[PDB]
RNA sequence: CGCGGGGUGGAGCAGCCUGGUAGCUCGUCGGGCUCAUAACCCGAAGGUCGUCGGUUCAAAUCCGGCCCCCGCAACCA
RNA sequence: UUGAGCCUUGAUGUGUAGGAUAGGUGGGAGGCUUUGAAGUGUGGACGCCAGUCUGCAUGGAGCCGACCUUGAAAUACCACCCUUUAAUGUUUGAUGUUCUAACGUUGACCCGUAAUCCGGGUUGCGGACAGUGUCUGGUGGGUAGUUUGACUGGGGCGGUC
RNA sequence: CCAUAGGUUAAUGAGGCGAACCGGGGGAACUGAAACAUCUAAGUACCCCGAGGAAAAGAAAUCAACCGAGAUUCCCCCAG
């Protein structure tokens, strides 16, 4: 299934390791090995009960750095997806952007939300692998 | 699957039924079909035509094993016995040899007296 | 007697409290079973009646160290 | 436990490791046969300092001692005569004791505990293969024949 | 009182779990059937999934309840 | 050998519209190729037998995103995962076989010793069973401690409280 | 084989008795609850083992309370 360029992407990010904060965005632009301007895919795991109606979360967040305000709606699988920025941004900028939307989840976390809420944090370049965050 | 090449067809053609069982050369069964399994209940069960479809439904259901050629060892009197080997040969199997293994005793036990 | 040679676990008495709390005098017996211990100094076997927890004291301490205590107390080993 | 080994052992040790084995395996097999010693620092320094270079290699010399036993029997074909009946059929099926008794006068002074005969305890009469397991590494085979005395 | 489930032509069981497309056997009729009665065989008539909402392109299904039918472990006010 | 949890890698999933054996969501429109290409020879894996996938290689260096009919977009690139499952690593459990050192031995023989007790020693047979302890379900009148109402034209029965 | 088990001799000490008290090991039921199973009676009766003139306990991994007290035992309060 794998080809040349993807093998290079795989040898930069090991899917068998959970990383810390400052390691994330540094290796983010190292994932995009294409010439055109790409974006970042934010996949955040929920601890909600997607099979139960009272916990299907949806909302928006006013981002001070843009990709403005981006909208997002969850799935019945339990993970919500949305983009938050692009590849060629500065390291400092997206640090506050990731901090921006997940604390917004602090706001939209249901009262019937059984279990630990924030499960797994992992952002990835549209042409890169998933960079996990604690 | 295991893909076997040669096998042997056991045809138990008795007075009421004609249960056909295709096994391998070692005796291990692969697939089987009966006259009473393909519908045909009652008087039509003890019929050579029912033995025909018994052979057809046993012709398949052994496709996953892919038997090229096989032998035939018929047993019992039965109304089929010779009409069932026809449908098994015309099905697409190579018949090498046909044998008869009807179990006749040498006055072993006292058969029933029934049927008045 | 049902007493462990090493430790000295003698049977104790207690109740057999039921669901309705009916107190019936029962008795707790140590886990005693004779075992043959290979002493390295004498290079032979010495049979002792020990409890299961008594065996663990033997393998954590020295088998000869245990026998030294029995020698100091008179229990014929 | 945490036992420190002396010999190699048939499956886990490499002559001087600290493998955590089952309590019974050490207390009933390893320790009484001198294959290993319990892991208590005093014994550990007795091993890693003293025996690490002394007793470790002299354990190798007895391995060469029965390497001597490999071919003490340049003959490797001893014949015993015991009473038998018609067409083979030994009356007194000789055991492991008697087979060792034959070689003590015609070769190795091997004892009972080393001879390993797979094909029964020798009831029949004819060509036989007797395997002497003098060590856990070397195997010595001896072809013997029994006579119908 | 909690942990699990099952609810389907008149009726016993399927399929659901892994979403879109409901099958099966008796009970009734047209006969065929034979100088006939009996047996047998073929064809046809009958539930839109217990019900109310959420989600989805789509709900019998996934999930929230109710009505319950139960399998129980319990059961020291 | 065989279940299960988990990790990684690689598969996996045809109402019907229809070039698509597409599950949801989804970011951006180039990946891709000569760290040896489209097409094809052939077997295997899968098979609602519709149409995928794929080791080596003659060949020889291309293949296609939006575009369009769809409720949806193209495993060209990618992330978190659902159902079905494949190898490995790893973790324990449940079975079958073999073995010997624990343990059993109310087998033989020798000794303590003129002793059918017992202990010890070679050896034979079983063998991680058996049996014993702690915990636990069941059974249990074998045994134990007890209850088994009052009124009542005497008590019982009936009736009542 | 060595060696232990065993055998023999000598030295030293022990055994039994005694009214209660004392420590430990085992341990009832009648009775009360107006019945009775938890509970009570009671760790009492009784049995057993051991020592002394007393015996047991005993110099804090104890309390207290953010101030302090200082091994154990017994008597009086605390307090029915």
PDB file of N, CA and C in Angstrom, chain A residues 15-79:
ATOM      1  N   UNK A  15       4.226   6.034  14.970  1.00  0.00           N
ATOM      2  CA  UNK A  15       2.863   5.905  15.477  1.00  0.00           C
ATOM      3  C   UNK A  15       2.789   5.156  16.806  1.00  0.00           C
ATOM      4  N   UNK A  16       3.922   4.630  17.256  1.00  0.00           N
ATOM      5  CA  UNK A  16       3.968   3.894  18.513  1.00  0.00           C
ATOM      6  C   UNK A  16       4.512   4.743  19.661  1.00  0.00           C
ATOM      7  N   UNK A  17       4.301   6.055  19.595  1.00  0.00           N
ATOM      8  CA  UNK A  17       4.791   6.937  20.650  1.00  0.00           C
ATOM      9  C   UNK A  17       3.897   8.162  20.864  1.00  0.00           C
ATOM     10  N   UNK A  18       3.678   8.499  22.134  1.00  0.00           N
ATOM     11  CA  UNK A  18       2.861   9.646  22.521  1.00  0.00           C
ATOM     12  C   UNK A  18       3.806  10.801  22.851  1.00  0.00           C
ATOM     13  N   UNK A  19       3.681  11.906  22.119  1.00  0.00           N
ATOM     14  CA  UNK A  19       4.553  13.060  22.323  1.00  0.00           C
ATOM     15  C   UNK A  19       4.019  14.148  23.248  1.00  0.00           C
ATOM     16  N   UNK A  20       4.885  15.117  23.534  1.00  0.00           N
ATOM     17  CA  UNK A  20       4.547  16.237  24.400  1.00  0.00           C
ATOM     18  C   UNK A  20       4.211  17.479  23.562  1.00  0.00           C
ATOM     19  N   UNK A  21       3.900  18.570  24.254  1.00  0.00           N
ATOM     20  CA  UNK A  21       3.511  19.835  23.628  1.00  0.00           C
ATOM     21  C   UNK A  21       4.434  20.414  22.543  1.00  0.00           C
ATOM     22  N   UNK A  22       5.588  20.922  22.968  1.00  0.00           N
ATOM     23  CA  UNK A  22       6.546  21.557  22.062  1.00  0.00           C
ATOM     24  C   UNK A  22       7.159  20.704  20.954  1.00  0.00           C
ATOM     25  N   UNK A  23       6.892  19.403  20.961  1.00  0.00           N
ATOM     26  CA  UNK A  23       7.444  18.522  19.934  1.00  0.00           C
ATOM     27  C   UNK A  23       6.511  18.520  18.718  1.00  0.00           C
ATOM     28  N   UNK A  24       5.229  18.733  18.988  1.00  0.00           N
ATOM     29  CA  UNK A  24       4.188  18.733  17.965  1.00  0.00           C
ATOM     30  C   UNK A  24       4.406  19.579  16.709  1.00  0.00           C
ATOM     31  N   UNK A  25       4.268  20.896  16.840  1.00  0.00           N
ATOM     32  CA  UNK A  25       4.399  21.784  15.680  1.00  0.00           C
ATOM     33  C   UNK A  25       5.770  21.809  15.002  1.00  0.00           C
ATOM     34  N   UNK A  26       6.813  21.420  15.728  1.00  0.00           N
ATOM     35  CA  UNK A  26       8.154  21.414  15.154  1.00  0.00           C
ATOM     36  C   UNK A  26       8.246  20.385  14.030  1.00  0.00           C
ATOM     37  N   UNK A  27       7.676  19.208  14.265  1.00  0.00           N
ATOM     38  CA  UNK A  27       7.711  18.139  13.276  1.00  0.00           C
ATOM     39  C   UNK A  27       6.516  18.208  12.324  1.00  0.00           C
ATOM     40  N   UNK A  28       5.669  19.219  12.504  1.00  0.00           N
ATOM     41  CA  UNK A  28       4.480  19.371  11.673  1.00  0.00           C
ATOM     42  C   UNK A  28       4.790  19.802  10.240  1.00  0.00           C
ATOM     43  N   UNK A  29       5.723  20.736  10.073  1.00  0.00           N
ATOM     44  CA  UNK A  29       6.067  21.190   8.727  1.00  0.00           C
ATOM     45  C   UNK A  29       7.037  20.216   8.071  1.00  0.00           C
ATOM     46  N   UNK A  30       7.548  19.282   8.867  1.00  0.00           N
ATOM     47  CA  UNK A  30       8.472  18.271   8.369  1.00  0.00           C
ATOM     48  C   UNK A  30       7.676  17.128   7.748  1.00  0.00           C
ATOM     49  N   UNK A  31       6.359  17.160   7.947  1.00  0.00           N
ATOM     50  CA  UNK A  31       5.470  16.140   7.400  1.00  0.00           C
ATOM     51  C   UNK A  31       5.082  16.507   5.973  1.00  0.00           C
ATOM     52  N   UNK A  32       4.846  17.797   5.751  1.00  0.00           N
ATOM     53  CA  UNK A  32       4.474  18.294   4.434  1.00  0.00           C
ATOM     54  C   UNK A  32       5.701  18.325   3.532  1.00  0.00           C
ATOM     55  N   UNK A  33       5.823  17.322   2.669  1.00  0.00           N
ATOM     56  CA  UNK A  33       6.955  17.246   1.756  1.00  0.00           C
ATOM     57  C   UNK A  33       6.485  17.525   0.327  1.00  0.00           C
ATOM     58  N   UNK A  34       5.530  18.445   0.210  1.00  0.00           N
ATOM     59  CA  UNK A  34       4.981  18.856  -1.078  1.00  0.00           C
ATOM     60  C   UNK A  34       5.198  20.361  -1.197  1.00  0.00           C
ATOM     61  N   UNK A  35       5.244  20.866  -2.423  1.00  0.00           N
ATOM     62  CA  UNK A  35       5.482  22.287  -2.635  1.00  0.00           C
ATOM     63  C   UNK A  35       4.298  23.221  -2.379  1.00  0.00           C
ATOM     64  N   UNK A  36       3.073  22.729  -2.552  1.00  0.00           N
ATOM     65  CA  UNK A  36       1.906  23.588  -2.350  1.00  0.00           C
ATOM     66  C   UNK A  36       1.497  23.726  -0.888  1.00  0.00           C
ATOM     67  N   UNK A  37       0.923  24.882  -0.558  1.00  0.00           N
ATOM     68  CA  UNK A  37       0.478  25.178   0.799  1.00  0.00           C
ATOM     69  C   UNK A  37      -0.623  24.220   1.251  1.00  0.00           C
ATOM     70  N   UNK A  38      -0.343  23.474   2.316  1.00  0.00           N
ATOM     71  CA  UNK A  38      -1.299  22.513   2.850  1.00  0.00           C
ATOM     72  C   UNK A  38      -1.888  22.985   4.180  1.00  0.00           C
ATOM     73  N   UNK A  39      -2.661  22.113   4.820  1.00  0.00           N
ATOM     74  CA  UNK A  39      -3.299  22.437   6.093  1.00  0.00           C
ATOM     75  C   UNK A  39      -3.071  21.367   7.162  1.00  0.00           C
ATOM     76  N   UNK A  40      -3.598  21.626   8.357  1.00  0.00           N
ATOM     77  CA  UNK A  40      -3.467  20.706   9.485  1.00  0.00           C
ATOM     78  C   UNK A  40      -4.812  20.080   9.854  1.00  0.00           C
ATOM     79  N   UNK A  41      -4.826  18.755   9.977  1.00  0.00           N
ATOM     80  CA  UNK A  41      -6.039  18.026  10.334  1.00  0.00           C
ATOM     81  C   UNK A  41      -6.059  17.753  11.833  1.00  0.00           C
ATOM     82  N   UNK A  42      -7.043  18.321  12.521  1.00  0.00           N
ATOM     83  CA  UNK A  42      -7.166  18.136  13.959  1.00  0.00           C
ATOM     84  C   UNK A  42      -8.203  17.069  14.296  1.00  0.00           C
ATOM     85  N   UNK A  43      -7.723  15.957  14.846  1.00  0.00           N
ATOM     86  CA  UNK A  43      -8.591  14.853  15.233  1.00  0.00           C
ATOM     87  C   UNK A  43      -8.501  14.673  16.745  1.00  0.00           C
ATOM     88  N   UNK A  44      -9.529  15.138  17.451  1.00  0.00           N
ATOM     89  CA  UNK A  44      -9.566  15.038  18.905  1.00  0.00           C
ATOM     90  C   UNK A  44     -10.608  14.020  19.366  1.00  0.00           C
ATOM     91  N   UNK A  45     -10.175  13.091  20.216  1.00  0.00           N
ATOM     92  CA  UNK A  45     -11.046  12.041  20.730  1.00  0.00           C
ATOM     93  C   UNK A  45     -11.901  12.483  21.913  1.00  0.00           C
ATOM     94  N   UNK A  46     -13.167  12.070  21.898  1.00  0.00           N
ATOM     95  CA  UNK A  46     -14.102  12.400  22.970  1.00  0.00           C
ATOM     96  C   UNK A  46     -14.342  11.206  23.886  1.00  0.00           C
ATOM     97  N   UNK A  47     -14.823  11.492  25.092  1.00  0.00           N
ATOM     98  CA  UNK A  47     -15.118  10.442  26.048  1.00  0.00           C
ATOM     99  C   UNK A  47     -16.622  10.356  26.222  1.00  0.00           C
ATOM    100  N   UNK A  48     -17.338  10.846  25.215  1.00  0.00           N
ATOM    101  CA  UNK A  48     -18.796  10.859  25.223  1.00  0.00           C
ATOM    102  C   UNK A  48     -19.407   9.525  24.805  1.00  0.00           C
ATOM    103  N   UNK A  49     -20.725   9.435  24.948  1.00  0.00           N
ATOM    104  CA  UNK A  49     -21.474   8.250  24.560  1.00  0.00           C
ATOM    105  C   UNK A  49     -22.186   8.643  23.265  1.00  0.00           C
ATOM    106  N   UNK A  50     -21.511   8.427  22.138  1.00  0.00           N
ATOM    107  CA  UNK A  50     -22.049   8.780  20.826  1.00  0.00           C
ATOM    108  C   UNK A  50     -23.353   8.067  20.459  1.00  0.00           C
ATOM    109  N   UNK A  51     -23.635   6.950  21.119  1.00  0.00           N
ATOM    110  CA  UNK A  51     -24.857   6.199  20.842  1.00  0.00           C
ATOM    111  C   UNK A  51     -26.062   6.815  21.552  1.00  0.00           C
ATOM    112  N   UNK A  52     -25.788   7.683  22.523  1.00  0.00           N
ATOM    113  CA  UNK A  52     -26.822   8.369  23.297  1.00  0.00           C
ATOM    114  C   UNK A  52     -26.913   9.830  22.842  1.00  0.00           C
ATOM    115  N   UNK A  53     -28.126  10.260  22.512  1.00  0.00           N
ATOM    116  CA  UNK A  53     -28.392  11.607  22.005  1.00  0.00           C
ATOM    117  C   UNK A  53     -27.941  12.818  22.827  1.00  0.00           C
ATOM    118  N   UNK A  54     -27.966  12.697  24.149  1.00  0.00           N
ATOM    119  CA  UNK A  54     -27.607  13.811  25.024  1.00  0.00           C
ATOM    120  C   UNK A  54     -26.147  14.258  25.033  1.00  0.00           C
ATOM    121  N   UNK A  55     -25.285  13.573  24.288  1.00  0.00           N
ATOM    122  CA  UNK A  55     -23.873  13.940  24.282  1.00  0.00           C
ATOM    123  C   UNK A  55     -23.272  14.239  22.912  1.00  0.00           C
ATOM    124  N   UNK A  56     -24.120  14.428  21.906  1.00  0.00           N
ATOM    125  CA  UNK A  56     -23.623  14.740  20.570  1.00  0.00           C
ATOM    126  C   UNK A  56     -23.285  16.230  20.515  1.00  0.00           C
ATOM    127  N   UNK A  57     -21.997  16.523  20.665  1.00  0.00           N
ATOM    128  CA  UNK A  57     -21.494  17.892  20.691  1.00  0.00           C
ATOM    129  C   UNK A  57     -21.285  18.568  19.335  1.00  0.00           C
ATOM    130  N   UNK A  58     -21.555  19.870  19.303  1.00  0.00           N
ATOM    131  CA  UNK A  58     -21.380  20.685  18.107  1.00  0.00           C
ATOM    132  C   UNK A  58     -21.238  22.146  18.526  1.00  0.00           C
ATOM    133  N   UNK A  59     -20.379  22.881  17.826  1.00  0.00           N
ATOM    134  CA  UNK A  59     -20.176  24.281  18.153  1.00  0.00           C
ATOM    135  C   UNK A  59     -19.098  24.938  17.312  1.00  0.00           C
ATOM    136  N   UNK A  60     -18.653  26.113  17.744  1.00  0.00           N
ATOM    137  CA  UNK A  60     -17.623  26.854  17.028  1.00  0.00           C
ATOM    138  C   UNK A  60     -16.683  27.563  17.998  1.00  0.00           C
ATOM    139  N   UNK A  61     -15.545  28.017  17.482  1.00  0.00           N
ATOM    140  CA  UNK A  61     -14.563  28.714  18.303  1.00  0.00           C
ATOM    141  C   UNK A  61     -13.952  29.881  17.536  1.00  0.00           C
ATOM    142  N   UNK A  62     -13.922  31.045  18.176  1.00  0.00           N
ATOM    143  CA  UNK A  62     -13.360  32.245  17.566  1.00  0.00           C
ATOM    144  C   UNK A  62     -11.838  32.160  17.645  1.00  0.00           C
ATOM    145  N   UNK A  63     -11.218  31.760  16.540  1.00  0.00           N
ATOM    146  CA  UNK A  63      -9.767  31.621  16.478  1.00  0.00           C
ATOM    147  C   UNK A  63      -9.085  32.948  16.143  1.00  0.00           C
ATOM    148  N   UNK A  64      -8.183  33.414  17.023  1.00  0.00           N
ATOM    149  CA  UNK A  64      -7.457  34.675  16.827  1.00  0.00           C
ATOM    150  C   UNK A  64      -6.323  34.624  15.803  1.00  0.00           C
ATOM    151  N   UNK A  65      -6.054  33.441  15.256  1.00  0.00           N
ATOM    152  CA  UNK A  65      -4.982  33.297  14.275  1.00  0.00           C
ATOM    153  C   UNK A  65      -5.452  32.800  12.909  1.00  0.00           C
ATOM    154  N   UNK A  66      -6.718  32.404  12.820  1.00  0.00           N
ATOM    155  CA  UNK A  66      -7.251  31.925  11.555  1.00  0.00           C
ATOM    156  C   UNK A  66      -6.640  30.625  11.060  1.00  0.00           C
ATOM    157  N   UNK A  67      -7.088  30.176   9.890  1.00  0.00           N
ATOM    158  CA  UNK A  67      -6.597  28.936   9.296  1.00  0.00           C
ATOM    159  C   UNK A  67      -5.533  29.214   8.237  1.00  0.00           C
ATOM    160  N   UNK A  68     -10.537  34.230  12.342  1.00  0.00           N
ATOM    161  CA  UNK A  68     -11.906  33.789  11.949  1.00  0.00           C
ATOM    162  C   UNK A  68     -12.490  32.784  12.925  1.00  0.00           C
ATOM    163  N   UNK A  69     -13.590  32.152  12.531  1.00  0.00           N
ATOM    164  CA  UNK A  69     -14.242  31.161  13.378  1.00  0.00           C
ATOM    165  C   UNK A  69     -14.643  29.937  12.563  1.00  0.00           C
ATOM    166  N   UNK A  70     -14.107  28.781  12.947  1.00  0.00           N
ATOM    167  CA  UNK A  70     -14.391  27.532  12.248  1.00  0.00           C
ATOM    168  C   UNK A  70     -15.423  26.691  12.998  1.00  0.00           C
ATOM    169  N   UNK A  71     -16.392  26.165  12.254  1.00  0.00           N
ATOM    170  CA  UNK A  71     -17.460  25.348  12.823  1.00  0.00           C
ATOM    171  C   UNK A  71     -17.115  23.861  12.762  1.00  0.00           C
ATOM    172  N   UNK A  72     -17.667  23.091  13.695  1.00  0.00           N
ATOM    173  CA  UNK A  72     -17.424  21.656  13.749  1.00  0.00           C
ATOM    174  C   UNK A  72     -18.583  20.889  14.379  1.00  0.00           C
ATOM    175  N   UNK A  73     -18.819  19.681  13.872  1.00  0.00           N
ATOM    176  CA  UNK A  73     -19.885  18.814  14.366  1.00  0.00           C
ATOM    177  C   UNK A  73     -19.330  17.391  14.457  1.00  0.00           C
ATOM    178  N   UNK A  74     -19.609  16.723  15.574  1.00  0.00           N
ATOM    179  CA  UNK A  74     -19.120  15.368  15.823  1.00  0.00           C
ATOM    180  C   UNK A  74     -19.742  14.292  14.935  1.00  0.00           C
ATOM    181  N   UNK A  75     -19.344  13.049  15.191  1.00  0.00           N
ATOM    182  CA  UNK A  75     -19.857  11.893  14.461  1.00  0.00           C
ATOM    183  C   UNK A  75     -20.433  10.912  15.482  1.00  0.00           C
ATOM    184  N   UNK A  76     -21.117   9.876  15.008  1.00  0.00           N
ATOM    185  CA  UNK A  76     -21.692   8.897  15.920  1.00  0.00           C
ATOM    186  C   UNK A  76     -20.638   7.852  16.284  1.00  0.00           C
ATOM    187  N   UNK A  77     -19.404   8.090  15.844  1.00  0.00           N
ATOM    188  CA  UNK A  77     -18.295   7.188  16.143  1.00  0.00           C
ATOM    189  C   UNK A  77     -17.552   7.678  17.382  1.00  0.00           C
ATOM    190  N   UNK A  78     -17.769   8.942  17.741  1.00  0.00           N
ATOM    191  CA  UNK A  78     -17.133   9.493  18.926  1.00  0.00           C
ATOM    192  C   UNK A  78     -15.974  10.466  18.761  1.00  0.00           C
ATOM    193  N   UNK A  79     -15.591  10.776  17.526  1.00  0.00           N
ATOM    194  CA  UNK A  79     -14.491  11.711  17.301  1.00  0.00           C
ATOM    195  C   UNK A  79     -14.933  12.859  16.395  1.00  0.00           C
TER     196      UNK A  79
END
